[PDB]
Amino acid sequence: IFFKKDSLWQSEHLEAVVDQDVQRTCILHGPVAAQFTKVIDEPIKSIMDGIHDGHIKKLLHQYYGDDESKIPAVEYFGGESPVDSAVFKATSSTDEESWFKALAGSEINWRHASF
């Protein structure tokens, strides 16, 4: 208990380790992801973007013929759970889910989101 207690925080504060010797310290890491971890102090925005951006190219090439015009588009992206002029009168019996889809509209826009 004296040895292993509270022993994660030195990775981030070697100024308080015996003589700032990292070699004394618990650092956590995976053996397989270790090979991909190389570029020091690289901004996180870059690492994440690097992945998404790279996926986007491979995907464009394979299934879009490198033509970005072929990518369908939509007002705003997201909000999907894994599952011309009219009048809706409402009663006790009207299904709530159905009702909102109507007022929502099919086109993805401000009115879609508003409902």
């Binding site: 208990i1 040895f3 292993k4 207690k5 990775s11 981030e12 504060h13 070697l14 700032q20 010797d21 990292v22 070699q23 004394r24 310290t25 618990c26 650092i27 956590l28 890491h29 995976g30 053996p31 397989v32 992801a33 270790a34 090979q35 991909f36 971890t37 190389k38 570029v39 020091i40 102090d41 690289e42 901004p43 996180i44 690492i47 994440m48 690097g50 992945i51 998404h52 951006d53 790279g54 996926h55 491979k58 394979q62």
Partner: protein, 128 residues
Amino acid sequence: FGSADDTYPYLTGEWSTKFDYPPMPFDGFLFGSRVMIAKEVKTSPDAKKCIAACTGVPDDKWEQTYKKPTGGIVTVRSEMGEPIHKIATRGVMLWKEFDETIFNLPKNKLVPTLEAKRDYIISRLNAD
């Protein structure tokens, strides 16, 4: 995972093909280790430097963490006995040795083994 590149086949669903299985596509990916070096994690300077210089190892040979240092990473057990993947520093390897020698023993053999190693134990603490 660490890059868009090695991660891609799991998105295509093409990964499952190596094993004579229908394409088996995934919906997203998480990156735990890959980010530990980022400019904005609190990981200390000398620690980021330590992390990088670890040569990885293919899924081909991760099992070896249980025995030797493998790509500069060993497993070591917490106070509760569950496995932990740690960078194989001197302190960690002492922790591993004690894991195998001292903590290993029955609660009956504990205090005698400690006394018979007090000098050694006390020395290795001070060093590593």
